[PDB]
Amino acid sequence: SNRSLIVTTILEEPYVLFKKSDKPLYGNDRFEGYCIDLLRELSTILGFTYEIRLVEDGKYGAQDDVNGQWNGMVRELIDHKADLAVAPLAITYVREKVIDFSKPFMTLGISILYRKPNGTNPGVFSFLNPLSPDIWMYVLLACLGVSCVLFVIARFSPYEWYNPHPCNPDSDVVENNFTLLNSFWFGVGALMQQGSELMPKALSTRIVGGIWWFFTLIIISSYTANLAAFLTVERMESPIDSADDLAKQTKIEYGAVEDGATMTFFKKSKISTYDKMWAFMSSRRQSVLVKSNEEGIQRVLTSDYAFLMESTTIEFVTQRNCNLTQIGGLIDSKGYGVGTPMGSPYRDKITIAILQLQEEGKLHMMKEKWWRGNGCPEEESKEASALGVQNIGGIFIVLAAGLVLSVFVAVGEFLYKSKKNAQLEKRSFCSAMVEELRMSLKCQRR
Amino acid sequence: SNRSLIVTTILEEPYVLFKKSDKPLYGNDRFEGYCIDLLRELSTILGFTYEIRLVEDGKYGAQDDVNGQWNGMVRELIDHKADLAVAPLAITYVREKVIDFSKPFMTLGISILYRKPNGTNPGVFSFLNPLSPDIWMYVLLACLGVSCVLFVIARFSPYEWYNPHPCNPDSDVVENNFTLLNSFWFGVGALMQQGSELMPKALSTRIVGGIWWFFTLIIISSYTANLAAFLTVERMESPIDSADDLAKQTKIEYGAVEDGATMTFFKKSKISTYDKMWAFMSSRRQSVLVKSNEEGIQRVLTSDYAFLMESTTIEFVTQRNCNLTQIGGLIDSKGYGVGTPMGSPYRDKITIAILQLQEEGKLHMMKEKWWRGNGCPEEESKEASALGVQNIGGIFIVLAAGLVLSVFVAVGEFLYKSKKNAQLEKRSFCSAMVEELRMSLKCQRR
Amino acid sequence: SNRSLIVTTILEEPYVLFKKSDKPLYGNDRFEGYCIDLLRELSTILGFTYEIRLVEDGKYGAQDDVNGQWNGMVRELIDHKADLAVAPLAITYVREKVIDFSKPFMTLGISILYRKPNGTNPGVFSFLNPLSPDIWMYVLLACLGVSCVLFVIARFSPYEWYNPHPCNPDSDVVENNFTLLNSFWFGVGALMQQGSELMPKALSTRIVGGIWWFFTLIIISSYTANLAAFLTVERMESPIDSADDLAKQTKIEYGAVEDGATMTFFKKSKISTYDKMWAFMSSRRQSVLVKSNEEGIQRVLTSDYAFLMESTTIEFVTQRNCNLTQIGGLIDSKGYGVGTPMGSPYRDKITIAILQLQEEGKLHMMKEKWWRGNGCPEEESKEASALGVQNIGGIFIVLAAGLVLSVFVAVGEFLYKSKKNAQLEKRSFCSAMVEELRMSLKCQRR
Amino acid sequence: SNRSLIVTTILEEPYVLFKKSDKPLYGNDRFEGYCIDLLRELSTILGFTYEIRLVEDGKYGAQDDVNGQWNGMVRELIDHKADLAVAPLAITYVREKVIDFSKPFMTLGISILYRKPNGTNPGVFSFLNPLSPDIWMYVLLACLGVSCVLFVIARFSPYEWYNPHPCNPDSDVVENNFTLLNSFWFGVGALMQQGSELMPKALSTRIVGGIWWFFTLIIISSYTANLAAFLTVERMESPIDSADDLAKQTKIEYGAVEDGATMTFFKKSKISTYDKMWAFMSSRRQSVLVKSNEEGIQRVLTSDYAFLMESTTIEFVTQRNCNLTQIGGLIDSKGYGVGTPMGSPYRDKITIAILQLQEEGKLHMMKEKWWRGNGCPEEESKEASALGVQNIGGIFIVLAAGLVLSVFVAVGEFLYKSKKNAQLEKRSFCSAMVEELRMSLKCQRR
Ligand SMILES: CCCCCCCC/C=C\CCCCCCCC(=O)O[C@@H](COC(=O)CCCCCCCCCCCCCCC)COP(=O)([O-])OCC[N+](C)(C)C
Ligand SMILES: CCCCCCCC/C=C\CCCCCCCC(=O)O[C@@H](COC(=O)CCCCCCCCCCCCCCC)COP(=O)([O-])OCC[N+](C)(C)C
Ligand SMILES: CCCCCCCC/C=C\CCCCCCCC(=O)O[C@@H](COC(=O)CCCCCCCCCCCCCCC)COP(=O)([O-])OCC[N+](C)(C)C
Ligand SMILES: CC(C)CCC[C@@H](C)[C@H]1CC[C@H]2[C@@H]3CC=C4C[C@@H](O)CC[C@]4(C)[C@H]3CC[C@]12C
Ligand SMILES: O=S1(=O)NCN(C2CC2)c2ccc(F)cc21
Ligand SMILES: O=S1(=O)NCN(C2CC2)c2ccc(F)cc21
Ligand SMILES: O=S1(=O)NCN(C2CC2)c2ccc(F)cc21
Ligand SMILES: O=S1(=O)NCN(C2CC2)c2ccc(F)cc21
Ligand SMILES: *[C@@H]1O[C@H](CO)[C@@H](O)[C@H](O)[C@H]1NC(C)=O
């Protein structure tokens, strides 16, 4: 029938926390958190009766050097007003001089919080990138230009008018093949490297086709080479994953809680990587050292802000917000711990207790309960450097647009020929219906 | 001041090891390492003197299960024949109930050692990789697609029905050279940049040949550019990435030291992933359970294998050798700690001391000394080996597959004709040997 | 201990500057910088106290040439109204004959500031760059070469003399389709990957068409690959690289502060390079001689210009701005030094002191503090802009040049034929207008 | 008529040095060096008479901490046995406590010495690199393989034997064009992307040509892509130019003089770059810290040795040996100086003198005299990333080899046809001479 114990906690999340319910009448039934699950299991295997009681200051603990005294939870331990400190109260060199701890039950770390890479969004015309929109207009102007020149040269040049029926010699007919329609077909035929028939014959037309070929060879070998340059630097581009990789940047900005434990590390740092990281912060001590963790989250979502905090509070917000991530490893290495008054007969019986809960694996079950929650749809890390339908893609759009464009021209040829010969003969339909049957007659004659 | 301290320590890799020098007589300088460098600052802040001994029955410590009867270092700390036991000694619930520990000075867990992804077996069909397998299906649906629309328009257009036989004008003959067979041949011919022997007249089927040419120019330039992106910046990856990925597969096989801290972890575990992993090792004992750490690396380094040791021992071996890396995060969490006999006041003194050295970062500065090294910086400079049969051997397979497909068609064409030669009032079997002599007639006439 | 020391100092960029904060009243904290950070370790080793004043007539110091009558800081050190004069004061023969100096704590010389090579005007004929201009000459000597050897073998081979007119066999007709004109056309046709309408039979001219095809496949694949190498990793360079390179040119124009240490250097020089450079500036005074340092950067940053100041002032400006760099090595060599009145024993004390701070590297640690910064790390990540008229505008020039060349040939072919129409017993002038009506006859017959 | 002065020097080069001549009888006419040119000009403008006298120890100066005394030149200054120290005696913190200096007359620096990049030597067949020598054998085996298959299929397939004289209908002849000679010409014609006539007609031969086209498209797009990978990483490869860039390496090894002033800098270094540089040296204190400068030069020429010394002695050996260079800037910053006894009336009159020689520019003339010598043919920094005749080059060898091979085949066709018809007719020569005339008859008939 010993005295019940009096623990002092602080309202952090997923740490101790009011039970979300109506009908208010509660003793120790107010609080519902990670540590209240921890205080329950430590009470079972040691056999004591706790009585939770919040801290009055609302602070962890610090030493006002002017007064030379303490505040917060750690003052309640010194004056023996409480005797347990089940809390996120970390382990520092200044605290252990005054009060006594147990062994750690969670491992902290400093790590970088930052927005996920949102995506690419190439737009499904990305094949059209490696030349300027001036060049794609000028090439199409050149192919209409050179075709209109080649039609004019093939009229005037007398060596072009050769003899048709080349297999039937000794007649009197001449015919050049470069009409207006075929002259575009030589230009388009040479532009897409496929060649054509009706090659130029006279030397005045050999020069035009001889120099248009050299125009196509430089364009297509430039489009192939430049598209290799886009796809090389995209795979060669890597997202940042370090503190040192984020140290070299200047466009992406740092951040911390004002006069917290994170700022304390960088002023006392001696690493050359971390030394310049304090130099960028102290240069900008108006816009990145914001106030606290709650304002540090909001600045990441609305900027290029790369806030730094402890590794636990990263792992709770990345599970509750799938926009965010945990770039980088662990900078520092700290730990939590149940605190006790100086020289008390409980720093051992909790040290025994925390290890026994570790052997049975309960601390990992208590962490996966509270820190995972409403399981994220996360994965979606496609990033596949292989041309899908997000990229090239739209070449099938202009392909299908061309084939539909052809069918309206095919109706145009079908109507124009059917109304041409019908002005010589039978009126409209008995000329048109017999052409559809002559089409539908599968025999290769008529 | 009083008499010196007998620091009982075991000898391992980079904590305590002999000097490699001359004059083999030294005494009290016979051991050096990280753990020895820890003691040099331990005697600086807290004043004491050394008599570093090595344990005569060198082990860490365990039960007897028949006499209780501890071994290793911690057997010496009970009988007070020793002192502070600064070593790679791990905090465990069984050990803490007997002697004492300080608060930990190094964190560690269980993680996975595995061969680094090499990239010298990419698969024999590696050339498909620059395009997504949707697009390889889509260009066949395009090439079979456009050829069918080419066949419809070529019969629908009246200007395609042209006059053959230019040696003989003024006839009734008419050809429509695009069959169903030739229409696929124009599409396949333009797809492979080789042209064809026929070509569209009659403008409504010029657009189809026009827009299909521009389709093939973008695809082949996209295939050439993206294949140039692969051979410039290679990006290899591991098959398995976490313990959950390694739990599912059975191609790679697992590994753990028998009767060690790792094997006893999975026997006591109750996670559904790890209980599957212990169900593996219990079945295949004496084949995957190594008997020592050094034999365990050789199982990775020779065979296809995965190994599970403590994370600090991984972080040294992966700096020495470049063949192998660490896969995944830390599974468990335990700590190394300074041993101390039960009730000695040096426990609380070193606990203050280790937190002091943490604040300047002397622990981190010493860990950089005794785990860094060569660094394996050869993940650069991209040697760019020549293409060979390891990479593009797949096209020699699909070349021979086409020719074997061709002979089955060539027999099918030979047997189809003799059926219609049997339609001309002959024997089907006799007319086969008649035509086979005509192939072997070998003259180029009739 | 005695009274304090009146440290007379001028105010400049990053040596001594005001604080940017609130509470404008401070006193003895009103100045901070590199040179102020030097004094903090100067009072640490050698004990003294501060009364930092600023010089009322702020200059460094020079003659009067009419009254002698020094100015600046060193006028105060003569009359003993001052003390140690730690500042950007330079050791010079005229100054050392009057007061004293310590041994120098910073080395510096005269070097050249200039615009960074940008790379946004590569030249309009930039596509010639992947091949050497020997090879562009060599493929024309090959294409004119192989076509001539094609013409010889085609007449030398009896199997090329084949039978034309396949509609009519059993004749005496024979063609040799390779003329001199067609032989160049086959070479140009195979060079531009377009094929031709004629093709060799007769095996001895198949090898020529065989080996020329393999010649063109290697060249065009080499042009495409090397052009892809340029657009991936750009490598810009400066026009001038040293003072000797800048001495020869007259396109870029020089620059120096009037009546400064730089302008007085070149007037006294006797090196043949620099005497040419002073012959430039004496001719073009009031156009290239700036009147202040800050106006001198603006001449570089706006116009095409080169500037010559001290090397330390360059090394700060090039860290702040990214538009401009340093070109070449140091020309002169001078030093900064702590001033001291004539005969004061503080000269030899600081001389010991500066050598002390050099040994730990406190000078180098402070110089990293007050000259580094943003660093301009943007010489990475290779934005890979699209090809445009700045880069491949040259082929539109050589396209239009070919067509204007074509019309002069087309007139030459039209006038050549009417000469032989005048050979058929007609007027040369009258038969021209007869044939010009036949082009304008516009019917496709006779 | 004051006393003549007694200077003590040491036999360094280009410092004081015996005059290379016979007929030995010399006073102060022995020595002939940089400093003897310096001692001459200081004697003129101050008006004293020197008397040179070498040091007896042969050492610069050092403090044996066991004895607590000095040696070398600096002991001769303390005991007043000499009174000048015109030498390469540097300025250190330990020397200036005991003796007094003048201002520096030369600026040292620590810099890295290393072998020049010897070259590339691609071998002029470098186009043949991006495929393995197995692939270039297998492609040539495939083109002989597929051609021999296509000849066999075109014999058996009855749809291949179409009608010749296609312009002359209604005859009875059949003729397939796929002979043995044309079947190779289809394979070679499709291999180099140029196409051909005599396209396959029956579906059994459409499959062979349909799948050989896909074989060529993968090969040529692989050869283009892989050659881009070679030429990208060659431009992306950069030679080392830093100390930090050489810090990351492990294949290229460091080096220093045993217990010299260079080793003194790295043990007292605090830069994280330089700290690991001492870690690599102290790990290998048997093979890189060789003995001295004379053995340090020989190790660079015969290894991958990257020796470190002062900046002056680099600049003398790189002018006398064009194999070597001065990679990197200046690590440290030191200086030389005329030394004097402690508190002597000459540390000022030399300080005045050295500046007056600096204003007239004589120290730069005295440096360009002795440190340049037998002016190097240096420049040869072509390194032009543009395909010259060192690269591709050899495609002109196989081009010229093919054209010479053709002419021996052309004689073979000319002899075989001339001896074929002559067995029907006229004996040998009057058939052969009339074919040469029929060749030489320029008319296109016969
Ligand atoms: C860069 C390189 C590009 C260029 C490529 C260069 C590469 C060069 C590589 C090689 C070049 C070799 C040239 C070929 C020489 C032959 C000559 C010829 O063709 O004409 C001849 C046709 O003879 C024939 O070849 C066709 C025969 C028709 C039917 C035969 C059926 C075979 C049976 C199926 C077998 C199935 C059994 C096996 C299956 C398991 C006729 O003309 P002739 O010669 O005047 O007449 C000779 C008459 N005599 C023969 C009686 C004397
Ligand atoms: C794969 C295709 C193979 C075929 C090859 C055929 C092309 C080979 C022919 C010629 C190339 C050889 C000349 C290049 C020499 C250096 C360039 C130069 O100095 O440019 C200068 C002159 O500006 C120009 O006028 C450009 C150079 C001539 C190109 C104009 C003719 C194009 C060919 C028309 C017919 C084509 C069709 C012909 C066949 C039907 C200025 O430019 P830049 O910015 O100062 O350049 C820097 C170079 N530099 C550092 C040395 C100064
Ligand atoms: C992806 C896309 C690829 C495909 C490309 C698609 C792109 C499409 C773009 C364009 C397509 C447009 C088609 C053209 C329509 C014409 C029809 C035709 O050709 O036949 C006609 C030939 O008429 C001629 O055009 C040739 C006449 C020859 C002599 C004329 C010389 C001109 C004088 C020099 C001038 C110098 C002065 C200026 C100098 C500064 C005849 O056939 P018909 O029509 O039955 O008869 C009509 C008779 N009527 C006219 C009396 C009614
Ligand atoms: C579909 C709408 C826009 C109408 C298009 C009309 C086009 C397709 C028609 C109208 C007149 C036609 C031309 C009339 C006569 C000839 C001469 C013949 O020897 C070849 C075809 C050719 C050259 C035709 C080509 C197609 C043509 C240009
Ligand atoms: O409170 S501690 O025992 N002392 C400091 N350490 C170390 C990083 C070594 C750590 C690291 C992680 C912890 F959880 C606790 C501690
Ligand atoms: O042996 S401990 O003091 N107690 C158990 N824990 C925890 C896993 C929470 C840890 C975690 C890391 C350590 F370094 C030590 C310990
Ligand atoms: O003011 S000095 O002591 N005298 C002149 N010298 C020398 C050029 C040798 C130098 C060179 C660099 C300095 F920093 C100082 C001096
Ligand atoms: O003998 S010193 O005046 N003291 C040290 N300094 C340096 C600040 C680097 C230098 C640098 C170059 C010198 F030539 C002399 C000196
Ligand atoms: C340069 O030539 C020397 C002399 O044999 C040779 O040892 C060295 O390897 C060459 N350099 C390179 C980079 O191959």
CSV table of N, CA and C in Angstrom, one decimal, chain B residues 168-196:
chain,number,residue,atom,x,y,z
B,168,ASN,N,2.7,0.4,-124.4
B,168,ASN,CA,1.4,0.3,-125.2
B,168,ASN,C,0.4,1.2,-124.6
B,169,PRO,N,0.2,2.4,-125.2
B,169,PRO,CA,-1.0,3.2,-124.7
B,169,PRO,C,-2.2,2.8,-125.4
B,170,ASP,N,-3.3,3.5,-125.1
B,170,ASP,CA,-4.7,3.4,-125.7
B,170,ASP,C,-5.2,2.0,-125.6
B,171,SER,N,-5.5,1.6,-124.3
B,171,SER,CA,-6.0,0.3,-124.0
B,171,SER,C,-7.1,0.4,-123.0
B,172,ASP,N,-7.6,-0.7,-122.5
B,172,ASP,CA,-8.6,-0.8,-121.5
B,172,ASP,C,-8.0,-1.3,-120.2
B,173,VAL,N,-6.7,-1.5,-120.1
B,173,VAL,CA,-6.1,-2.1,-118.9
B,173,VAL,C,-6.0,-1.1,-117.8
B,174,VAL,N,-6.1,-1.6,-116.6
B,174,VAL,CA,-6.0,-0.7,-115.4
B,174,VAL,C,-5.5,-1.6,-114.2
B,175,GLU,N,-4.6,-1.0,-113.5
B,175,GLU,CA,-4.1,-1.6,-112.3
B,175,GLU,C,-4.3,-0.7,-111.1
B,176,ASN,N,-4.2,-1.4,-109.9
B,176,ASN,CA,-4.5,-0.8,-108.6
B,176,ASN,C,-3.5,-1.2,-107.6
B,177,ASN,N,-2.2,-1.1,-108.0
B,177,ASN,CA,-1.1,-1.8,-107.4
B,177,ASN,C,-1.1,-2.1,-105.9
B,178,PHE,N,-1.7,-1.3,-105.1
B,178,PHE,CA,-1.9,-1.5,-103.7
B,178,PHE,C,-2.9,-2.7,-103.6
B,179,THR,N,-2.5,-3.9,-103.3
B,179,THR,CA,-3.4,-4.9,-102.9
B,179,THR,C,-3.5,-4.9,-101.4
B,180,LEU,N,-4.0,-5.9,-100.7
B,180,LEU,CA,-3.8,-6.0,-99.3
B,180,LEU,C,-2.4,-6.4,-99.0
B,181,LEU,N,-1.8,-7.2,-99.8
B,181,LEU,CA,-0.4,-7.6,-99.5
B,181,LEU,C,0.6,-6.5,-99.7
B,182,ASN,N,0.5,-5.7,-100.8
B,182,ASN,CA,1.4,-4.6,-101.0
B,182,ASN,C,1.1,-3.4,-100.0
B,183,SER,N,-0.1,-3.3,-99.4
B,183,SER,CA,-0.3,-2.2,-98.5
B,183,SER,C,0.4,-2.5,-97.2
B,184,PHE,N,0.5,-3.7,-96.7
B,184,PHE,CA,1.3,-4.0,-95.6
B,184,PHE,C,2.8,-3.8,-95.9
B,185,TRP,N,3.1,-4.1,-97.2
B,185,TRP,CA,4.5,-4.0,-97.6
B,185,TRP,C,5.0,-2.5,-97.7
B,186,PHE,N,4.1,-1.6,-98.0
B,186,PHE,CA,4.5,-0.2,-98.0
B,186,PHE,C,4.6,0.3,-96.6
B,187,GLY,N,3.8,-0.2,-95.7
B,187,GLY,CA,3.9,0.3,-94.3
B,187,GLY,C,5.1,-0.3,-93.6
B,188,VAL,N,5.4,-1.6,-93.8
B,188,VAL,CA,6.6,-2.1,-93.3
B,188,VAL,C,7.9,-1.5,-93.9
B,189,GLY,N,7.7,-1.2,-95.2
B,189,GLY,CA,8.8,-0.7,-96.0
B,189,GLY,C,9.2,0.7,-95.5
B,190,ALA,N,8.2,1.6,-95.3
B,190,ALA,CA,8.4,2.9,-94.8
B,190,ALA,C,8.8,2.9,-93.3
B,191,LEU,N,8.4,1.9,-92.5
B,191,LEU,CA,8.8,1.8,-91.1
B,191,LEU,C,10.3,1.6,-90.9
B,192,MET,N,10.9,0.8,-91.8
B,192,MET,CA,12.3,0.4,-91.7
B,192,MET,C,13.2,1.3,-92.5
B,193,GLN,N,12.7,2.5,-92.9
B,193,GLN,CA,13.5,3.5,-93.6
B,193,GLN,C,14.1,3.0,-95.0
B,194,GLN,N,13.5,2.0,-95.6
B,194,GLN,CA,14.1,1.4,-96.8
B,194,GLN,C,13.4,1.8,-98.1
B,195,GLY,N,12.3,2.5,-98.0
B,195,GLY,CA,11.5,2.8,-99.2
B,195,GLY,C,10.8,1.6,-99.7
B,196,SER,N,10.3,1.7,-100.9
B,196,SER,CA,9.7,0.6,-101.6
B,196,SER,C,9.8,0.7,-103.1
